[PDB]
Design an enzyme around this catalytic site. Structure first.
Site, PDB file in Angstrom:
ATOM      1  N   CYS A  27       4.700   1.609   9.039  1.00 59.65           N
ATOM      2  CA  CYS A  27       4.478   0.482   8.146  1.00 59.65           C
ATOM      3  C   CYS A  27       5.753   0.095   7.413  1.00 59.65           C
ATOM      4  CB  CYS A  27       3.391   0.800   7.134  1.00 59.65           C
ATOM      5  SG  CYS A  27       1.773   0.852   7.946  1.00 59.65           S
ATOM      6  N   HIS A  69       0.824  -1.204   0.000  1.00 56.96           N
ATOM      7  CA  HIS A  69       0.000   0.000   0.000  1.00 56.96           C
ATOM      8  C   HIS A  69       0.863   1.260   0.000  1.00 56.96           C
ATOM      9  CE1 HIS A  69       0.234  -0.666   4.389  1.00 56.96           C
ATOM     10  NE2 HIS A  69       0.469   0.622   4.326  1.00 56.96           N
ATOM     11  N   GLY A 104       3.494   6.051   9.618  1.00 52.27           N
ATOM     12  CA  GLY A 104       4.847   6.031   9.096  1.00 52.27           C
ATOM     13  C   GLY A 104       5.587   4.760   9.485  1.00 52.27           C
TER      14      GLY A 104
END
Ligand SMILES: *[C@](O)(C(=O)N1CC(C)(C)C1)[C@H](C[C@@H]1CCCNC1=O)NC(=O)[C@@H]1[C@@H]2[C@H](CN1C(=O)[C@@H](NC(=O)C(F)(F)F)C(C)(C)C)C2(C)C
Ligand SMILES: *[C@](O)(C(=O)N1CC(C)(C)C1)[C@H](C[C@@H]1CCCNC1=O)NC(=O)[C@@H]1[C@@H]2[C@H](CN1C(=O)[C@@H](NC(=O)C(F)(F)F)C(C)(C)C)C2(C)C
Lengths: 306, 306
Positions: free
Chosen positions: A145, A41, A143
């Site tokens: 991820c 993503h 942030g």
């Protein structure tokens, strides 16, 4: 003496963390050899994430659409594929600090260290257990991820977790490094909730052994019990069943303390039924289930990594 | 979301750890530039440690009496001095991985990461607070001495702690990196015990702010209190006094949540008097005092290091 929740030293993993930017989205990636691994993503906007077609968005990207940055250096992407929920970016440079490593898919019950990263830089490190409902209880902001969880075995890093999402109740979900989610979560901003969680019985017992080793013995009663009986009492306090494999895994701790697993099971059954009665074990007022037997041995024998 | 006890990433410190052997004694040392720092009781035997004359034992040592080993390499000692309870070995090689660093002497109340080492190799990393009685609650076995505690500020490692000894109740004592003990402990196997410890009030409040940020708000009552009143109630639960400096330090958290420090103080005073009533805060059934305000902000804003 003493007993602490303790993570693996992070150095081998620190030297693999990169910032991956695509459009305005920035999240962390893992640079091993000449591949950067990150959550897919990264190719979405806010709009996109409600119901994204990932194969479609990725079609429309060139290699140059991916900024990969490793401190001062910018790596040039020369390839990109998707494996499940992970994006793989082939870069032009192999990471000189790639450690010996493996990709593992851990089992519910197993612990690992998380190296929390923002903008491809490490914020800190803590230990987590993969809960039975296939969540973890982390500390992750926006942030984070692409942050990874890992175990170290001597010199070899087993990556088992990459961070993707946060669920109601503020628990966390993610993938193995092959991009398969742990549990039934999808990478889509949709209503999803964790199943109700259980207590990992073998881990609680491992923690009781650690307590005894550290001298905290007030809770040892003088009875035995049978595995059968123990499991029935534990069924009602939402503890997982203890199998004979679990008993076997507790063997080292049992042997080092001279307390049969089933004597310890007797002591735990009492604690579950009578509660802790205003007393702590190893500082804690609740029973802890986030230490595996190996973790306890590791910490109480002195196992060490390089 | 989520709130975890979280250590600084250890990589910068990992590349400084060495094994220091003298006779049969082996413990860990810190290799910065071309100096190895370790506890001076590396020059003792079992006999010696009951009442050692350290100046005397050291007189009788040559440089060659010190084996310093950094994985496969052995560093050659070319000098040795003693500063307080720390031994300084000048080696022939500067550590290529010496990070930017400083030596600090922390204050009671302040936290740091400990990198637990055996035989100059890292076992793991966890966060600790310097308690008001000048102990820490670590996990340290035989061989752990010379393990260091540190804070990271961006790229610069502030070493503040080196591990020397374990006290009754299984708490731990050590020195700054200039070899001055924290608290009144001596490096001598003699009966020594810690003073009774207090709860670090400002840290408890910082943790309450973290709770609110993470959505756990059941304990916010609707009252204010005065600093004066708060301190009197806290005096009897063995909490340190809250000074106006402490109030000022909580300013960011107060501002980010819109809860005056003294409204939070009101809520804590209630918890101390009525207890937690079968309820947890941030998973915990006890009040936590091992998170500073900076730690909470660090974790709840995303401060990051490289
Ligand atoms: C992660 O994607 C990330 O760090 N960033 C995306 C941007 C660019 C904003 C930075 C992000 C981490 C979480 C953010 C909230 C706080 N904690 C986190 O761990 N992940 C997401 O935002 C995640 C991506 C879309 C929606 N995500 C998400 O976690 C949702 N959760 C859900 O929809 C739920 F079903 F509840 F799990 C929230 C934003 C928290 C509502 C996708 C899943 C692709
Ligand atoms: C540290 O010196 C070490 O790791 N090693 C020395 C050897 C070679 C045996 C490996 C050691 C660490 C502690 C060992 C017990 C478990 N936990 C520890 O942190 N430190 C010592 O053994 C320490 C040195 C002599 C006696 N030490 C010590 O800690 C005493 N404690 C006390 O005397 C007390 F006053 F209680 F603090 C015990 C061994 C625990 C009784 C010296 C202080 C120089």
């Amino acid at each position: 003496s003493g007993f602490r929740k303790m993570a693996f030293p992070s150095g081998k993993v620190e030297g693999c963390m990169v910032q991956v930017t695509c459009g305005t989205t920035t999240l962390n990636g893992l640079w091993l050899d000449d591949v950067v691994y990150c959550p897919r993503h990264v190719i979405c906007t806010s709009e996109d994430m409600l119901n994204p077609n990932y194969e479609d968005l990725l079609i429309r990207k060139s290699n140059h659409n991916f900024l990969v940055q490793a401190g001062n250096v910018q790596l040039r992407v020369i390839g990109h594929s998707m494996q499940n929920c992970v994006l793989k970016l082939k870069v032009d440079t192999a990471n000189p600090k790639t450690p010996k490593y493996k990709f593992v898919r851990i089992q519910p019950g197993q612990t690992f260290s998380v190296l929390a990263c923002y903008n491809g830089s490490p914020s800190g490190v803590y230990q987590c257990a993969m809960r039975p409902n296939f969540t973890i209880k982390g500390s992750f902001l926006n942030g984070s991820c692409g942050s990874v969880g890992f175990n170290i075995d001597y010199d070899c890093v087993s990556f088992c977790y990459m961070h993707h999402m946060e669920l109601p109740t503020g628990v966390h979900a993610g993938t193995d490094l092959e991009g398969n989610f742990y549990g039934p979560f999808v990478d889509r901003q949709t209503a999803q909730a964790a199943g109700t969680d259980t207590t990992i019985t073998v881990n609680v017992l491992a923690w009781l052994y650690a307590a005894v080793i550290n001298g905290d013995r007030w809770f040892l009663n003088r009875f035995t019990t049978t595995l059968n009986d123990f499991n029935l009492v534990a069924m009602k306090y939402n503890y997982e069943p203890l199998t004979q494999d679990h008993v076997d895994i507790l063997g080292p701790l049992s042997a080092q303390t001279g307390i049969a697993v089933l004597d310890m099971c007797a002591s735990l059954k009492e604690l579950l039924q009578n509660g802790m009665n205003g007393r702590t074990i190893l500082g804690s007022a609740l029973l802890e289930d986030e230490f595996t037997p190996f973790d306890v041995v590791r910490q109480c024998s002195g196992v060490t990594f390089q």
